[PDB]
Paper text:
In the nucleus of the infected cell, influenza polymerase (FluPol) uses the viral genomic RNA (vRNA) as template to perform synthesis of either capped and polyadenylated viral mRNA (transcription), or unmodified anti-genomic copies (complementary or cRNA), which then serve as the template for vRNA synthesis (replication). ANP32 is required for both vRNA to cRNA and cRNA to vRNA replication. ANP32 comprises a folded, N-terminal leucine-rich repeat (LRR) domain followed by a Glu-, Asp-rich intrinsically disordered region known as the low complexity acidic region (LCAR).
Consistently, the majority of particles in the apo-FluPolB-hANP32A cryo-EM analysis are dimers and monomers, with a minority of trimers. A minority of particles are apo-FluPolB trimers, whose overall structure was determined at 3.57 Å resolution. These particles comprise the FluB replication complex, which is similar to that of FluA, with an additional third polymerase forming a FluPolB symmetrical dimer interface with the replicase. The FluB replication complex is only seen as part of a trimer (determined at 3.57 Å resolution overall), with an additional monomer, FluPolB(S), making a symmetrical FluB-type dimer interface with the replicase. FluPolB(S) is less well ordered with only the core visible and not the peripheral domains, likely due to flexibility. The encapsidase component of the FluB replication complex cannot simultaneously make a symmetrical dimer as it uses the same interface (i.e. the PA-arch and PB1 β-hairpin) to interact with the replicase. This shows that the encapsidase component of the apo-FluPolB symmetrical dimer would have to disassociate to be able to form the FluB replication complex. For FluPolB, based on the observed trimer structure, where the third FluPolB forms a different symmetrical interface with the replicase, we speculate that it could have a distinct role. It might assist in replication termination by binding the replicase and releasing the 5’ hook of the template so it can be copied.
Numbering used by the authors:
A (entry chain C): 1 to 249, 256 to 500
B (entry chain A): 1 to 49
C (entry chain C): 701 to 766
D (entry chain A): 147 to 716
E (entry chain B): 1 to 31, 34 to 189, 201 to 643, 652 to 670, 684 to 752
F (entry chain D): 340 to 388
G (entry chain E): 703 to 752
Write the structure that this text describes.
């Protein structure tokens, strides 16, 4: 075939156009050359397929020695023809030959399918061993979330995925391995050993590996579990007015702890960034540096986001204040320094936001919309998710809003530090004070009549779904979906 | 280009290059190629040493 | 290290590449073609470690001068 | 000094070992390769050109075009650029509004029930002609030449041959009795063409192509076409004018549409709609789905609309197959269907024949002519306004059980295209449209009380009465209807939305949805306001011209709006 | 008793049964488009006839400028947009967002400096001036690249889109323009050849500015036909860059419905309505205006878009500002081609003839129909001698979707006029806007609605007073999605998607089942509906590929072989629905390809035969579509005999060069190759190495080696 | 078991599990049948002892 | 946890006493100004337990 390759090359070069294009376009430009196809795409695939299936020989067979296994006409039925072709330069055939091949003909090897299509058989295994339960026909509350459609063996960014695929199934053309093969050496060797002994076309394996590695994420309405295993069956599990019980047939906590430890270690020293990145890229979790699960999940705890910023990775640009994730909707707040007396009687000089603003606010499982003016909280809409999460959301939004009532509600003292022993800004000191003593600003905040309406219903200081709610707070019996346009905008690291 | 710089270079080298550019009053954003060149220079120097 | 350097004649495969002792020079093809000359490594490298140590030395120098 | 092309210059060769130079060169080559993959390599400019920046300057013609393409009041794009970069508007919108005439406004008027009036009053007027039957095939008049068969599936030609063989009197009928020749078609042409059809079907040879090939050419009117000339002669000649557009006729409410709507939505002992099996259901959810599916098919399968839909789908599938296989030869196509009775006997039904013309067409919008001959038991003289497009005979009579009834042949020339031809085989989706909504309905009920109600809504149980909708009316008295009957009504509505579908139907539905949503808002006391009501009404009523389904939809809309008006008192 | 389907709405809300109202099961309307194009030109110039009328001295075509024109004094559509008001809206948007304009412009510039010319190959059919027709984007780009080579124009070989746009702008100044045209020479046979043709500067400018027209036949829910315009390759780069910039800007804007699609849009809709309900004052009313804009592109002047581009890039490099301002300039001086012309016939002689557009006025107008008579009597002033209409004002549908959406969002975001006691905010997306106005009573709500309508009229936007209405918040419709009391019914319109995908058996099946499961997830398709959809799809799939159950007595060519296979193999639960096997798919396993699903149930001989490592029915070049099914939809299939492809329905140069390169470097077909050297030398080196390795392994004979090396030396690489 | 040991090793006085997920899904506590009104069962034909 | 004057006290009386003490503490610590103090006692005077 290499001789056929050289003969075809010589014949192609005999024309001057081939000589001038080949000697002109560099290897990089080849992509452009490939994309100059006719693009005479069929206007209606259904009609085309219908017509073709009725034709004598619609199948376009590639020239080869396979045809000799089957006669051009078997049992008085025409199968294949020896007429030349112009579109593909091969032969023509009919589905009759395909059915005969499925009936008789050469018998192939069954080994390759045990491991090559591992993801599909794992899907089948998770389906078969799953345990079903009852069906709840009552209404189901669903939230729109960014979910991973399918489980991944090891989530990696697209470029690393492509490089790994090439390093696996393309032994040649592997110049200068980057700082990605050492991270995924175990995956490289495992997939290499598994796929060895096959004869499938390499492109099929490459696409299957891309599916098995590159992540696929989408906005979906979900209620309950969110792991890819449950998302696979979301079409059956969920339902607008029906729900089903399903149980399909870790590293996260460890990475959270490691990132927190790195942050605490680096902060106490001077120039924390270099020390933190040194420890982060010098760390490992049982087979791999920390850039193997940090790069896997989207965002995460604030410590992980800070470490990813210190390292090279993309982090969602949501504003983290304590535990609150804030997304601005409108308005511009002018941060101006001001001297304000605290409820304890002391006077603090801190930055206050002049002007009106609104933020989508998230905390754990609680979502809401907050609208605040300078030195005052104006409105807050929430959904009933969890008592702990709701209390955290209320208190944190209270502290963030810098409402004068929150300042006047202080009763103890603010001189706290961190595990590293540092004095924080008054905002975070107040955050810690109020979270430690939740029943401090709640009592003196003041109460507001219940939100008289079809669905809007109040919540009391104890987080129970009780009327006579807090001033401003409102709980709507609907679904609040927020945090759109996750641009991952450019963010600097000090 | 800045995305490539962030991906292929450590944050430390990027910080050093940005500091060097600031010393010369040159904006890293307006001359991303120069920032990449400075980052490569720092990286090769560290690799040599 | 280096360019084509035809002194070695034709190129050699990975299997024949391994036969060369450490420190030799070989003529290989990089990516889709791009003939080059390579040298077998005698160690395993870690660019992150090198950069971190360089930064540590730099800041040690800065502190000592300060 | 190191270069990206794997070469270097060293003042002293002993300063760096082999490993150091190799590693630096490897890093440089990796950077170069990554840049090339990201296409930044060419854009990248070294330590001598990085002080220049990108160069992209506008030529002369483009600069002039930019200069003359500036808003009014400017004389050069530099002027506009400076104006935009410097001038600051601080209330220009209010300044413009403060002077704009007060004769422009949305004209906000609150909408009440009285404002809503019947749409398309011209249908009521009796001076206009009754709407004709323009659908492709007969729906409530099809006469099924039914032959019991063991179950073997055979070619349509052989099936039609056998069906005619059973009925020798109709097969060998050769002296027609013209009941009515509509306006233009020729009785001789149609009768001779039908006789050739019967002879071809009953011929011993398996070929199903017309043996004349010349009489049909004039029977179908293929030769009655203009001959195209070149533009020059048309310019020179004075009598070569432009045909005036042919607008659709403005008709009135017919009566056959209502009767067909009623009849196609009734159970019949005959069932044709069959569906392929699916895998075993192991999850509870799919068990519930299977129960619902069974309860639905037990209802839809026996309605005549399902049989009509299957007949349409089969006819269009066969038409597409014949057109693709045969391009430039006239063909004979039986209008075949398969019907299983409750006892499991798989009757094959022949509903007529059709001559297909020459379908040699490269494009899809190109028209192909087909003439349909249809068996029927309805004498058109009972209502001649329904059949102004049909030339019919009286080809005999038959006994179904001892009650003799006549048998006529409705002959009509028509034309289709590959688009409608494909949509014929996609008309099955009506079934889906019938289930989805009902599914939702049932699900809503399930939301109320916990258990599953699909047996309760359909047949009822000891705790809940069977679900009943409002389906019809009589003497001004609205009547309820079972869940199955409502499902049948929805399925027939979808089938009619298909069969009588064209531009008018789309323009009517997509524009009367405005009034539907306005009525829905009014029923919820949202106090909807409107800007130009007469505009919406005119938009809607400029679509009720000649489509029978559009006229009947307008009539039913007016009646239902009257009902809502009378019931709004509470 | 007389049945009445409408009575269903007596016992059910309209939104719940909204799916049945739409006739999305019948034949969609289908079509000369010259009449519609002339009517569109007539309407576009009529709306702006009061502007400043001048004559372009670069092309000689009449131009009408409505910008900064007289303020409309009537409800009729107005394209007279005041520039100062547009800049005020842009400034308010900039103030309301932190440096969004700068970030968006910088990101657009960065992604532009990385974009390649070949990106222009995507999209739909494009106008080709070398033939003055509509050709596939790839072919049009290739032909223009080839033509440019003759007139000393280059940059396509240079790669990036910057040089291609630069030499495109240069081409407008060349005193001549040479290219290759198709010559259908008579020899009787009509043989097409390439003829080196030349055109002058004015002709080339007109060709580049011309906009080809076609009839929008695919429309489903509109009686009257609209004309869609396709532009040339010389505008594609600039339009693409401006559209990307506008997308970057509008993505952050919470008021923009685009480019997010699917459940994201529903989330945005519900979130916005909930926000407005929360923001209402005590006892005040938040009214929702369901709006459906009309003449959304026949009133938008490209000059306003030029101003918007300049203001958006307030702080950016001068070169980028000039580059991104070219598209508004090209659109502000565009020309419209005119269909294929009217047809005149005489019935006394059975004669007919289509009159090409250039000869529109070669005939006495007294021979056209009265309607076309008036159309031509009104189109005469702007008619070009070549057969094109000078259409400066307004835009054709589909070009600046993102930029027009950004202008609409700018109008929405003003949020107040005169500090009146109300506020407004809404959702806008490409000719469909839903507005919300909060006040203390209905009267103030409509005061605000009228103020917003007036403000829209100051930008060329003219909301349709006939297709729009107003009601209380909590019930409205946006882009055919209905919201009522928190219930957002995805209007069931994905019904025309259950037909076979027409790519091959296994792929069609996978696509169909994935479509069913996605519909279940998104549109609320009930389990019974999904089961019936599976049934109907399997029926259609078996019928279309002539493969029913082997047991069934149906006759067919492949059916006989299926019958044979039915008893020639014992395991009968492992056959595929393409091999007459029993259907096994249900709701629980729509996400699993059937080949893996039935792998256990197959027989060793059957799986060996079907899953052979080599199949003459499977080819490498057939793998292109294994990822995305043409919208690019991802589907999961399995390699096998049923993975075949249908027969086909400087071309060969590029095609065979790329094919040979792929066959040499098998890795090229998957990932972009990298290298700064000629393709020829890479292939030569690879082939030399491969020949040596083949010989050393004994796979090639010595004479074979010598022949190969002789050929390589002849090539000049050894 | 991991959740149990985590709860044992924590500091809160209570011995109450806080990760109810695995506890609920492990003992088959969600697989219990749902009781319906007797009338439906009488009407239903598939409900047999 | 427990500030209820239990022992058959009318819940309204207990509320009146609790609010009186809360207002006293708020004023003493400075949470409320004299205007709010007097307003609260006015309302508490209107209650009947003050």
């Amino acid at each position: 075939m290499t001789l056929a390759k050289i003969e075809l090359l010589k014949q192609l070069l005999r024309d001057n156009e081939a000589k001038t294009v080949l000697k002109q376009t560099t290897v990089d430009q080849y992509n452009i050359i490939r994309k100059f196809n006719t693009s005479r795409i069929e206007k209606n695939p259904s009609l085309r397929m219908k017509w073709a299936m009725c034709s004598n020989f619609p199948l376009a067979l590639t020239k080869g020695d396979m045809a000799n296994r089957i006669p051009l006409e078997y049992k008085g039925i025409q199968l294949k023809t020896n007429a030349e072709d112009i579109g593909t330069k091969g032969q023509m055939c009919s589905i009759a030959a395909v059915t005969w091949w499925n009936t008789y003909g050469p018998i192939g090897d069954t080994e390759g399918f045990e491991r090559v299509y591992e993801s599909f058989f794992l899907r089948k295994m998770r389906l078969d061993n799953a345990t079903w339960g009852r069906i709840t026909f009552g209404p189901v509350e669903r939230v729109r979330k960014r979910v991973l459609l399918n489980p991944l063996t090891k989530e990696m960014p697209p470029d690393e995925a492509s490089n790994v695929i090439m390093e696996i199934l393309f032994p040649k053309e592997a110049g200068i391995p980057r700082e990605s093969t050492w991270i995924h050496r175990e995956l490289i060797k495992e997939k290499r050993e598994k796929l060895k002994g096959t004869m499938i076309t390499p492109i099929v394996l490459a696409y299957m590996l891309e599916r098995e590695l590159v992540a696929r994420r989408r906005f979906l309405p979900v209620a309950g579990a969110t792991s890819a295993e449950f998302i696979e069956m979301l079409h059956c599990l969920q339902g607008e007015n029906w729900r089903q019980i399903y149980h399909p047939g870790s590293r996260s906590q460890s990475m959270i702890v490691a990132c927190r430890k790195i942050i605490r270690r680096s902060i106490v020293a001077s120039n924390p960034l270099e020390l933190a990145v040194e420890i982060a890229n010098k760390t490992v979790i049982d087979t791999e540096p920390l850039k193997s699960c940090l790069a896997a999940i989207d965002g995460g705890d604030v410590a992980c986001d800070i470490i990813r910023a210190a390292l090279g990775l993309k982090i969602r640009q949501r504003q983290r204040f304590g535990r609150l994730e804030l997304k601005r909707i409108s308005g511009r707040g002018f941060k101006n320094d001001e001297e304000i007396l605290i409820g304890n009687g002391t006077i603090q000089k801190i930055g206050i936001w002049d002007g009106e603003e609104e933020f989508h606010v998230r905390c754990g499982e609680c979502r809401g919309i907050l609208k605040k003016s300078k030195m005052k909280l104006e409105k807050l809409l929430i959904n009933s998710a969890k008592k702990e999460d709701m209390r955290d959301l209320i208190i944190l939004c209270m502290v963030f809003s810098q409402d004068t009532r929150m300042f006047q509600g202080v009763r103890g003292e603010i001189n706290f530090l961190n595990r590293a022993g540092q004095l924080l800004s008054p905002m975070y000191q107040l955050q810690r004070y109020f979270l430690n003593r939740s029943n401090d600003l709640f009592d003196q905040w003041g109460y507001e009549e219940s939100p008289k309406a079809s669905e809007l219903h109040g919540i009391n200081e104890s987080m129970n779904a009780s009327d006579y709610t807090l001033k401003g707070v409102v709980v709507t019996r609907n679904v609040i979906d927020d945090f759109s346009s996750t641009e991952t905008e450019k963010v600097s690291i000090t | 280009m800045d995305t490539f710089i962030t991906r292929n270079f450590q944050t430390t080298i990027i910080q050093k290059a940005k500091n060097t550019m600031a010393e010369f009053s040159e904006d890293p954003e307006l001359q991303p190629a120069m920032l990449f060149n400075i980052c490569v220079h720092l990286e090769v120097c560290y690799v040599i040493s | 290290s280096g360019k084509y350097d035809p002194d070695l004649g034709d190129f050699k495969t990975i299997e024949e590449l391994e036969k060369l002792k450490p420190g030799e020079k070989a003529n290989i093809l990089l990516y889709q073609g791009k003939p080059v000359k390579v040298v077998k490594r005698k160690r395993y490298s870690a660019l992150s470690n090198d950069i971190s140590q360089g930064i540590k030395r730099q800041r040690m120098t800065v502190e000592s001068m300060g | 000094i190191f270069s990206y092309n794997q070469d270097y210059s060293l003042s002293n060769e002993s300063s760096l070992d082999e490993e150091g130079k190799g590693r630096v060169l490897s890093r440089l080559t990796e950077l170069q390769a990554e840049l090339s993959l990201k296409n930044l390599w060419q854009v990248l400019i070294g330590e001598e050109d990085v002080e220049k920046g990108i160069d992209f300057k506008l030529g002369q013609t483009i600069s002039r075009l930019r200069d003359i393409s500036v808003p009014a009041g400017f004389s050069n794009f530099e002027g506009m650029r400076s104006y935009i970069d410097n001038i600051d508007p601080k209330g220009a919108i209010e300044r413009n509004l403060a002077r704009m005439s007060p004769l422009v406004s949305v004209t906000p008027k609150k909408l009440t029930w009285e404002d809503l009036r019947p749409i398309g009053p011209h249908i009521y007027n009796h001076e206009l002609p009754e709407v004709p039957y323009n659908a492709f095939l007969l729906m409530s008049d099809e006469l099924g030449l039914a032959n019991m068969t063991e179950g073997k599936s055979k070619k349509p030609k052989t099936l039609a041959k056998e069906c005619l063989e059973k009925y020798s009197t109709l097969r060998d009928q050769t002296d027609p009795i013209l009941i009515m020749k509509s306006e233009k078609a020729n009785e001789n042409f149609l009768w001779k063409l039908w006789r050739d059809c019967v002879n071809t079907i009953s011929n011993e040879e398996m070929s199903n192509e017309l043996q004349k090939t010349n009489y049909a050419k004039w029977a179908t009117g293929d030769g009655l076409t203009y001959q195209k000339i070149m533009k020059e002669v048309a310019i020179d000649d004075e009598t070569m004018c432009q045909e005036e557009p042919k607008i659709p006729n403005k008709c009135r409410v017919a009566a056959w549409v209502q009767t067909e709507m009623n009849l196609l939505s009734t159970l019949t002992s005959k069932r044709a709609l069959d569906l392929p099996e699916i895998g075993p259901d192991v999850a509870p959810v799919e068990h519930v789905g299977s129960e619902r599916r069974k309860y639905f098919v037990n209802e839809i399968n026996y309605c005549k609309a399902s049989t009509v839909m299957m007949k349409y789908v089969l006819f269009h599938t066969s038409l597409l197959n014949e057109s693709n296989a045969s391009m430039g030869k006239y063909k004979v196509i039986p209008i075949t269907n398969r019907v299983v009775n409750e006892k499991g006997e798989s009757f094959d039904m022949l509903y007529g024949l059709a001559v297909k013309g020459q379908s040699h067409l490269r494009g899809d919008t190109d028209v192909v002519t087909v003439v349909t001959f249809e068996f029927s038991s309805t004498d058109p003289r009972v209502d001649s306004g329904k059949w102004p497009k049909y030339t019919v005979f009286r080809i005999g009579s038959l006994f179904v059980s001892g009650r003799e009834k006549s048998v006529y042949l409705y002959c009509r020339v028509n034309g289709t295209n590959k688009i409608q031809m494909k949509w014929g085989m996609e008309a099955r989706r009506c079934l889906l449209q019938s289930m989805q909504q009902m599914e939702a309905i049932v699900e809503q009920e399930s939301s109320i009380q916990g258990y599953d109600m699909t047996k309760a809504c359909f047949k009822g149980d000891r705790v809940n009465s069977p679900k009943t909708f409002s389906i019809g009316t009589q003497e001004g008295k609205l009547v309820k209807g079972s869940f199955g009957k409502a499902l049948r009504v929805i399925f027939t509505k979808c089938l009619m939305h298909y069969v009588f579908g064209n531009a008018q139907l789309e323009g009517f539905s997509a524009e009367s949805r405005r009034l539907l949503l306005l009525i829905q808002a009014l029923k919820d006391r949202k106090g909807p306001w409107v800007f130009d009501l007469e505009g919406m009404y005119s938009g809607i009523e400029e679509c009720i011209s000649n489509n029978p389904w559009v006229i009947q939809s307008a009539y039913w809309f007016n009646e239902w709006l009257g009902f809502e008006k009378e019931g709004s008192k509470v | 008793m007389n049945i009445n389907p409408y009575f269903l709405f007596i016992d059910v809300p309209i939104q719940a049964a909204i799916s049945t109202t739409f006739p999305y099961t019948g034949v969609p309307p289908y079509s000369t488009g010259t009449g519609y194009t002339i009517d569109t030109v007539i309407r576009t110039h009529e709306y702006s006839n009061k502007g400043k009328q001048y004559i372009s001295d670069v092309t000689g075509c009449t131009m009408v400028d409505p910008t900064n024109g007289p303020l409309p004094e009537d409800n009729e559509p107005s394209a007279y947009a005041q520039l100062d008001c547009v800049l005020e809206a842009l400034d308010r948007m900039d103030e309301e967002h932190p440096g969004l304009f700068q970030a968006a412009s910088q990101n657009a510039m960065e992604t532009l400096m990385v974009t390649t010319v070949d990106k222009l190959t995507q999209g739909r059919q494009t106008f080709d001036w070398t033939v003055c027709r509509n050709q596939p984007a790839a072919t049009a780009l290739n032909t223009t690249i080839t033509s440019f080579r003759l007139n000393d124009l280059n940059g396509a070989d240079k790669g990036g889109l910057i040089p291609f746009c630069q030499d495109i702008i240069d081409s407008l100044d060349r005193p001549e323009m040479t290219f290759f045209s198709v010559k259908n020479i008579k020899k009787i046979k009509r043989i097409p050849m390439k003829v080196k043709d030349k055109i002058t500067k004015v002709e080339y400018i007109k060709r580049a500015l011309s906009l080809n027209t076609m009839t929008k036949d695919a429309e489903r829910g509109k009686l009257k036909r609209r004309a869609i315009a396709t532009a040339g390759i010389q505008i594609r780069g600039f339009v693409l860059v401006v559209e990307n910039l506008a997308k970057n800007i509008c993505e952050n804007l919470e008021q923009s419905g685009l480019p997010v699609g699917g459940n994201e849009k529903k989330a945005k809709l519900s979130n916005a309505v909930a926000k407005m309900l929360s923001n209402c004052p005590p006892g005040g009313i938040s009214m929702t205006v369901t709006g459906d804009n009309t003449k959304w592109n026949e009133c938008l002047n490209p000059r306003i878009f030029l101003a918007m581009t300049e203001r958006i890039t307030r702080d950016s490099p001068i070169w980028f500002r000039d580059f991104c301002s070219i598209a508004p300039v090209l659109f502000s001086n565009k020309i419209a081609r005119l269909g294929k012309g009217f047809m005149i016939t005489s019935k006394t002689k059975r004669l007919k003839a289509q009159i090409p557009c250039p000869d529109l006025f070669s005939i006495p107008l007294e021979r056209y129909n009265e309607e076309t008579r008036a159309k031509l009597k009104k189109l005469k002033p702007f008619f070009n001698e070549e057969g094109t209409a000078s259409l400066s004002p307004g835009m054709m549908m589909g070009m600046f979707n993102m930029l027009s959406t950004v202008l609409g969002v700018a109008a929405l975001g003003i949020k107040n006029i005169g500090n009146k006691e109300y506020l407004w905010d809404g959702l806008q997306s490409s000719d469909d806007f839903a507005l919300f106005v909060n006040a203390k009573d209905e009267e103030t709500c409509m005061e605000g609605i009228n103020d917003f309508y007036r403000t829209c009229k100051l930008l060329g936007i003219n909301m349709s007073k006939k297709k729009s209405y107003c009601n209380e918040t909590g019930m409205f419709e946006f882009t055919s999605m209905f919201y009522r009391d928190g219930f957002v019914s995805n209007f069931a319109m994905e019904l025309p998607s259950f037909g076979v995908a027409g790519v091959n058996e296994s792929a069609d099946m996978a696509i169909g089942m994935t479509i069913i499961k996605n519909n279940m997830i998104n549109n609320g398709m009930g389990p019974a509906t999904a089961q019936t959809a599976i049934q109907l799809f399997i029926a259609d799939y078996r019928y279309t590929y002539k493969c029913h159950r082997g047991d069934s007595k149906v006759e067919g060519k492949r059916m006989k072989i299926i019958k044979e296979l039915w008893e020639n193999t014992k395991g009968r639960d492992g056959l595929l629905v393409a091999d007459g096997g029993p259907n096994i798919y249900n709701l629980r396993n729509l996400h699993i390809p059937e080949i893996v699903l039935k792998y256990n149930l197959m027989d060793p001989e059957y799986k060996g035969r079907l899953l052979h490592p080599q199949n003459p029915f499977v080819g490498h070049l057939s793998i292109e579509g294994i990822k995305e099914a043409d919208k690019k939809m991802d589907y999961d299939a399995v390699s096998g005999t049923h993975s075949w492809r249908t027969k086909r329905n400087e071309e060969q140069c590029y095609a065979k060069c790329c094919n040979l390169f792929e066959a040499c470097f098998n890795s090229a077909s998957y990932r972009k190759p990298v290298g700064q050297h000629s393709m020829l030398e890479a292939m030569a080196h690879r082939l030399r190495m491969d020949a040596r390795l083949d010989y050393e392994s004994g796979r090639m004979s010595k004479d074979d080696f010598e022949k190969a090396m002789a050929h390589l030396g002849e090539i000049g690489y050894i």
